Amino acid sequence: KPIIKGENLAYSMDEKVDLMKGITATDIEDGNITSKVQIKSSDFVEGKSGIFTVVYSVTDSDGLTSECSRTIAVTDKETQLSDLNWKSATIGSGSVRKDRAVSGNQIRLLNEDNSVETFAKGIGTHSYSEIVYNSEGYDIFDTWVGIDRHVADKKVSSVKFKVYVDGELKAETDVMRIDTPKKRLVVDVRNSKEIKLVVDVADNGNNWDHADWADAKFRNLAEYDASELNKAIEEAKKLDLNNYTEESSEALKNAISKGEEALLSKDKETINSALEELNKEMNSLVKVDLNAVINIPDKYLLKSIQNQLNKTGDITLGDMYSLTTLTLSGVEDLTGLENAKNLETLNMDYNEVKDLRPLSKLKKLNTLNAQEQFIAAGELKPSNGKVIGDSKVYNREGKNVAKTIRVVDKNGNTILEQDAKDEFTINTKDLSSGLYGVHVLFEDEGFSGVMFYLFNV
């Protein structure tokens, strides 16, 4: 013989539905058995816009069972009735007001906790009142109702709110008085032509029956759905990016991030495009080949890596990925180290390297020791009575970090000194016969040395 109650609800797309919200159960014998209520059945799907049905069941001490049913709408776009024109409006006293109470004051109703709720939007009327709207093309009507707070001191105010859809009563309140907290009415208006909002007089005629339809609005189902994109994002996140090439994994990571962003758009085309792109990048993934051999042209770099890994013979991509620290001896060319994606530390002081660009994309290389390089860059051959040489020494950013050029005779005398550019030109017509050295001094964070050329006059 238990009594189980629950009224229709509505949520927006952003909100988390509580299937048990506003469900209560009582039993004269058992007392309050709300916590004993179970969901018997539902068509509810999370993440879906719709008007869902939930059936609730409860069973007391003596095994007697009661049921009830209500709908829960999950909607997107809203249209305030105060932003529309009514087809017709009657009112017992005063004028129907858009976005104000009938008194002209702000719409104000009573909350359950006896605070006052002040509303920006709604319809202010007065019993007896019938207001008719064109309801074509809308899904849900939602409103708060109660006695306007302007008449809080008037004692007698009393009304009943009723909602008719195409002439049929679909929702109503009990009699509401000044001290009655606001009530919500959530009504299915799908495939309808008119809604009629009625404020009846209850007791004491219409006296002081200032009545508000606060935040009265239509709510429509969403014109997008985020569910497939959500699933694709989840599917993508399951994949082990270690199975795939750096490049293709990066593309996928980027598609995942764009998917997460597109969910916030609440826009069908944006969501659909992000899903298409994510599916594309998933299908575009390329399996890594950790056994592919890496070209390491510098025999000293090859020996350095072989020693670090304790192996002989060819170095593979997987081998390169295992490097976290590496010490170099005798290296001139870092070609191959582009593949050392996990490298954290490179100890290469007193090597022979003029170009750090192969290290540029090593994202974890936080410790680079590359001081006191000496690069024997060979002979320059005079032509047109001059020598022209390259003085580019590249850091990881591809910046030329050469600082100064010094030209030195056979007796160690500096004969020319200038700030370094990308190239230098030396007149050889006015030099005494013999050997000359060109010292290109360079310096940058962690990277320094001399690049040396010889020329003969």
Ligand X SMILES: CC(=O)N[C@@H]1[C@@H](O)[C@H](O)[C@@H](CO)O[C@H]1O
Annotation: binding site for Ca(2+): 158, 201, 203, 205, 209
Q: Which residues are annotated as a binding site?
A: 93, 158, 201, 203, 205, 208-210
Give the Cα separation of 313 and 338 in Å (integer): 19
Stretch that binds ligand X, among 206-214, 225-233, 244-252, 394-402 (CB under 6 A): 206-214
Q: Rule CB under 6 A: is residue 94 a binding residue for ligand X?
A: yes
Chain residues 47-86 in contact with ligand X, contact rule CB under 6 A: none
In the complex, the smallest distance separating the C-beta of residue 256 from ligand X, rounded to whole angstroms, is 59
Could you say which of 24, 53, 207, 404 contacts ligand X (CB under 6 A)? 207
In the complex, the smallest distance separating the C-beta of residue 87 from ligand X, rounded to whole angstroms, is 23
Whether residue 124 contacts residue 149, with contact meaning beta carbons closer than 8 Å, is answered with no
Could you say which of 140, 202, 368, 393 contacts Ca ion (CB under 5 A)? 202
- Three-state SS for 369? strand
Minimum CB distance to ligand X smaller for 94 or for 437: 94
Q: Rule CB under 6 A: is residue 103 a binding residue for ligand X?
A: yes
Rounded to whole angstroms, what are the CA distances from 297 to 66, 335, 357? 83, 7, 16
Identity (one letter) of the amino acid at 28? I
Whether residue 302 contacts residue 329, with contact meaning beta carbons closer than 8 Å, is answered with no
Identity (one letter) of the amino acid at 138? Y
Partner interacting with residue 100 (select from ligand X, Ca ion, none; CB below 5-8 Å by kind): none
What DSSP character marks residue 182?
Answer: P
Give the Cα separation of 283 and 243 in Å (integer): 13
Q: Rule CB under 5 A: is residue 368 a binding residue for Ca ion?
A: no
Give the Cα separation of 27 and 37 in Å (integer): 12
Kindly state the tokens that stand for 132: 């008719």
Chain residues 289-328 in contact with ligand X, contact rule CB under 6 A: none
Q: What is the DSSP string of 5-26?
A: E---EEEETTSPP-TTTT-EEE
Stretch that binds ligand X, among 55-63, 71-79, 207-215, 299-307 (CB under 6 A): 207-215
Task: Count how many Cα atoms sit within 13 Å of the Cα of residue 235 in the half-sphere of its side chain.
Answer: 14
In the complex, the smallest distance separating the C-beta of residue 94 from ligand X, rounded to whole angstroms, is 3
Minimum CB distance to Ca ion smaller for 201 or for 294: 201
Partner interacting with residue 202 (select from Ca ion, ligand X, none; CB below 5-8 Å by kind): Ca ion
Q: Rule CB under 6 A: is residue 208 a binding residue for ligand X?
A: yes
Minimum CB distance to Ca ion smaller for 68 or for 211: 211
Q: Which residues are annotated as a binding site for N-acetyl-D-glucosamine?
A: 93, 208, 210
Partner interacting with residue 208 (select from ligand X, Ca ion, none; CB below 5-8 Å by kind): ligand X
Q: Rule CB under 6 A: is residue 90 a binding residue for ligand X?
A: no
Q: What is the DSSP string of 196-251?
A: EEEEE--SSTTTT-EEEEEEEEEE---S---HHHHHHHHHHHHS-GGGB-HHHHHH
Burial of 79 from C-beta contacts in 10 A (0-12 / 13-18 / 19+): middle
Positions touching ligand X (CB under 6 A) are 93-94, 102-103, 126, 207-208, 210
